[PDB]
């Protein structure tokens, strides 16, 4: 309850081993396609939120958008879960297969 300094593990602006621009950059795109002109109160969840992501580096290799879209913690119901969920369509626009139909939004 309340903790916040230094030693803890701080936002980094480049991008680190386990995140690059690939999948960082790829987020900031996505938070534009749901609304053109966002806001600060926009990032302030996004920033924040993938601080906690990027902790459990289980969608770096295999690439889970969908599972990202779901690391919320509880009151995500629409405003950064949703730009993960962008990524999901997204991602089937590659050279590799049509998927499938089955996990219901």
Request: proline letters at 11%.
């Amino acid at each position: 309850m309340g903790r916040i300094f230094s030693r803890s593990a701080s936002p980094i602006p480049r991008p680190p081993r386990g995140l690059a621009a690939h999948h960082w950059l790829n987020f900031l795109q996505a938070a534009y396609r749901l609304e053109p002109g966002p806001s600060s109160y926009d990032f302030h969840q996004l920033k924040k939120f993938l601080k906690i992501a990027l902790e459990t580096p289980v969608w770096i290799c295999p690439i889970n958008y969908s599972l990202l879209a779901s690391l919320l913690p509880k009151g995500y119901p629409g405003r950064v879960n949703e730009i993960l969920h962008i990524l999901i369509q997204t991602q089937a626009q590659i050279p590799s297969r049509p998927a499938h139909h089955h996990h219901h939004h």
